[PDB]
């Protein structure tokens, strides 16, 4: 939410940078301050001065990617889920880690099978109204965000049906995250 | 650097610790023989730590200890077989070769088997500081000529009589193939109870671990024996021979025949058969073919030879087997003449 309205600039930082920056935050350092320049930006954190030339070119869209009607609210605990999810993947598809979900309403249900025999099953809870979300996605992606999600009530806004599910912190909206289903 | 002939390897081996006993030569029988003699006497000489480690064309190098006082968990000198690159040690190699020369080569008693080095390698510093301590053992093969001699001494390796009548026939037919000839004498010795060579006996069973050279055919051709040469080839087939070889070798002789035919039709036969080459025995066959083979009729033949060569070699037509039947008679022109459409 914070920031300024103060101009954004093509500040497309790489992959690496963001890491050190991220590093330059933690509570620690000074607060992170930015001169967002297209040019470069000039970041202030630690005894450093971290500065990129920026790759200048667009950064692909990010509003569309939100599910089509992410709306069923799958208020779960990010953690529990993150656990359950972790377990389920094992005898889920072992390739893409594409767990398939059939979140029983208000509960949850998950049915995973690793093609290669086996199957994993969970029963968890998600305050989820609206009929089974019946969407599977790459659990490999997911957990990542659960965990980058410091928020532990994460409401998912899905459109129940093998379509994108937005997950956001339920608790704020900061972290809003979208992954996409697997196969059709 | 001292060149030694394998049979005299003991001279330098024994007398003193030669650093790099460099068995450059190529007769495998000779190389093998020069290798094991150093080793044997090396292993005996407290260098039992004996390892083989090639020197790739690759920079290679590994055990470059040559003194460091690292051991006393397993102290001793060791010895290091280097199989050389194609032409010998290259850079990196040369380098780390020149290092060893520089040091006690302690624990790295050099045994460099290989081949003849390249010149620049031999002028390359490493091959400069080995000198005077190393031993080059020429492991190069007999001429046709020295071949019987050798062969004859070599008989007594097997102690069996051998027959020099046979020796020759071995020297020709195994002209230049010491190793297999050595094994030749072995298979048959076993095969009989007696295992005594002599020519009659070596006819009855012939070592099927030792080749019947192109010569038989081509020479048969020299003569003009346009059937003889042909038969040897029926055999050269069942035998599976790569045609390349036959071509190669045939090419060798025939181009030699051209050139000698240019100068021969006015220069006594066979002198030139050895003023160049053309074995002794061939020389006759060969002095003939110049007279038989008049350089002109000879031209079209080359044109077919080339033809086949290309058929093979660019085209990988494996019908060169049939192309030759033409050529035999195209070249020979029969034992007489009988030159015909090319193929």
């Amino acid at each position: 939410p914070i920031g300024q309205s103060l101009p954004s600039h093509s500040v497309i930082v790489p992959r690496k940078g963001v890491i050190e920056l991220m590093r330059m935050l933690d509570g620690g350092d000074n607060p992170l301050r930015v001169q967002i320049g297209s040019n470069n930006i000039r970041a202030h954190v630690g005894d450093f001065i971290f500065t990129s030339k920026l790759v200048d070119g667009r950064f692909p869209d990010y509003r569309r990617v939100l599910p089509k009607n992410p709306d069923k609210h799958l208020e779960a605990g990010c953690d529990l889920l993150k656990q359950a999810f972790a377990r389920a993947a094992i005898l889920s598809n072992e390739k893409f880690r594409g767990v398939r979900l059939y979140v029983s309403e208000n509960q949850l249900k998950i049915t995973a099978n690793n093609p290669e025999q086996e199957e994993a099953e969970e029963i968890l809870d998600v305050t989820y109204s609206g009929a089974e979300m019946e969407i599977g996605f790459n659990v490999s992606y997911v957990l990542d965000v659960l965990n980058a999600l410091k928020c532990e009530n994460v409401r998912m806004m899905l459109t129940d049906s093998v379509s994108s599910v937005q997950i956001e912190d339920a608790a704020s909206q900061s972290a809003a995250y979208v992954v996409m289903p697997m196969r059709l | 650097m001292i060149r030694l002939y394998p049979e005299q390897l003991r001279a330098q081996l024994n007398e003193g610790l030669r650093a790099a006993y460099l068995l450059l030569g190529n007769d495998p029988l000779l190389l093998q023989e020069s290798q094991d003699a150093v080793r044997q006497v090396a292993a005996a000489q407290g260098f039992e730590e004996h390892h083989t480690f090639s020197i790739d064309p690759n920079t290679d190098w590994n055990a470059i200890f040559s003194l460091c006082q690292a051991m006393s968990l397993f102290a001793s000198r060791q010895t290091l077989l280097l199989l050389l690159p194609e032409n010998g040690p290259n850079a990196a190699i040369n380098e780390q070769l020149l290092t060893l020369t520089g040091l006690l080569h302690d624990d790295l008693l050099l045994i460099v088997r290989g081949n003849k080095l390249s010149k620049a390698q031999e002028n390359a510093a490493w091959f400069t500081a080995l000198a005077n301590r190393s031993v080059q053992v020429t492991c190069q093969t007999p001429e046709q000529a020295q071949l019987p001699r050798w062969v004859a001494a070599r008989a007594k390796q097997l102690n069996l009589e051998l027959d020099d009548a046979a020796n020759q026939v071995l020297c020709y037919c195994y002209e230049g193939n010491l190793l297999a000839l050595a094994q030749a004498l072995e298979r048959l010795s076993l095969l009989w109870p007696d295992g005594k060579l002599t020519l009659p006996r070596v006819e009855q069973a012939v070592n099927d671990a030792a080749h019947f050279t192109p010569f038989h055919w081509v020479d048969a051709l020299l003569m003009g024996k346009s059937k003889r040469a042909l038969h040897i080839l029926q055999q050269l087939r069942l035998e599976g021979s790569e045609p390349v070889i036959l071509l190669r070798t045939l090419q060798r002789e025939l181009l030699l025949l051209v050139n000698l035919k240019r100068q021969s039709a006015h220069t006594p036969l066979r002198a030139l058969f050895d003023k160049h080459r053309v074995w002794q025995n061939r020389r006759g066959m060969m002095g003939e073919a110049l007279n038989r083979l008049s350089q002109t009729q000879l031209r079209q033949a080359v044109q077919l030879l080339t033809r086949t060569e290309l058929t093979l070699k660019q085209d990988y037509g494996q019908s060169v087997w049939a192309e030759l039947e033409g050529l035999s008679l195209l070249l020979c022109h029969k034992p007489l003449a009988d030159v015909f459409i090319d193929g």
Binding site: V55, D56 | R248, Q251, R299, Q303, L305, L310, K313, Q314
Partner: protein, 334 residues
């Protein structure tokens, strides 16, 4: 090679054009890379990468230029062939290319120039199609060939060709002459023999090639009457056999020219010899023969496992066969 003066005007247009973005960022310079294209190319990058600054300069100054001079210009690439090959592989390509999707990395435009695009590979080339066609930002691509023939068409669909013939023979000779002593006939004989390309013309006088040219020339004059060609095996038997094979051809051809009445020769480095060919040989067979000289020249290059010699020899005999009657005398076709 080196930058020669005759690379400049090409450059200017191109940079002009480039600067005007009329000049397409692509570019193809026919001219031998032997007749200067490389330096010309790189002269361009020199500028182009530093963003094209000044109207047209090779850039002596510029950070781009100098960092490109240091080469450390990341923008900068030299993009030679791959060395695990010797042709400019796909991979080589894949890289530099993809680095340009990260924009400029130290500014100025990039210039990513192939040294001799003549030297590209196919996975490389195929790879390069889309990049040479499609313009990435600040990219000025610069390619070099012996001749345009050094490249594929689909590529050239998009090559903004900036032709560049050899400079004229005269100049190509004067240019050639400066640097190799031996008569302008040898310069020219050679130059001419080079399809008039200098860069190409020059090489001849190096080595014992042009001396062997002569050498060869001599043995042959003996060969020809004598019907011993076989003498020539060596004169032409060489790593430059094809070249020596080439030395020879241009004379055979000169003899057929005499066979069409034609003073004109491409080896003006001796006309006597030329005459005698025609002289001892009917054109039919001269002509037949001329074919084959190259053909061997080809074969020496084409046949796997081919005895250079074997081939050099067969030929002599066979010539020798032709000089001879009855021995049917071709003319080349079917």
């Amino acid at each position: 090679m080196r930058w020669y003066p005759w690379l400049r005007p090409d450059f200017e247009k191109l940079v002009a054009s480039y600067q005007a973005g009329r000049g397409h960022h692509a570019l193809l310079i026919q001219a031998l890379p032997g007749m200067g294209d490389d330096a010309l190319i790189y002269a361009l990058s020199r500028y182009l990468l530093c963003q094209q600054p000044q109207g047209h300069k090779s850039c002596g100054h510029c950070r781009g230029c100098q960092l490109m001079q240091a080469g450390t210009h990341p923008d900068y690439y030299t993009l030679a062939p791959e060395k695990g090959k010797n042709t400019l592989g796909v991979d080589a390509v894949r890289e530099v290319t993809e680095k340009l999707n990260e924009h400029a990395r130290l500014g100025g435009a990039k210039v990513v120039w192939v040294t001799d695009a003549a030297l590209l590979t196919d996975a490389a080339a195929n790879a390069l199609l889309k990049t040479l066609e499609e313009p990435p930002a600040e990219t000025w691509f610069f390619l070099a060939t012996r001749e345009p023939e050094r490249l594929l068409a689909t590529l050239r669909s998009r090559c903004r060709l900036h032709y560049l013939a050899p400079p004229p023979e005269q100049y190509a000779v004067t240019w050639l002459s400066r640097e190799v002593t031996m008569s302008q006939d040898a310069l020219l004989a050679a130059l001419r023999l080079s399809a008039g390309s200098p860069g190409a013309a020059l090489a001849l006088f190096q080595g014992d090639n042009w001396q062997a040219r002569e050498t060869l020339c001599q043995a042959l004059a003996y060969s020809v009457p004598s019907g011993d060609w076989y003498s020539l095996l060596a004169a032409l038997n060489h790593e430059q056999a094809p070249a020596r094979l080439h030395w020879l051809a241009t004379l055979l051809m000169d003899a057929l020219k005499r066979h069409h009445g034609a003073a004109q020769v491409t080896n003006v480095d001796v006309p006597g010899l030329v005459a005698e060919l025609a002289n001892h040989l009917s054109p039919s067979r001269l002509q037949a023969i001329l074919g084959d000289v190259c053909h061997i020249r080809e074969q020496l290059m084409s046949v796997t496992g081919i005895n250079r010699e074997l081939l050099i020899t067969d030929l002599l005999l066979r010539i020798e066969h032709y000089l001879q009657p009855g021995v049917v005398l071709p003319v080349p076709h079917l």
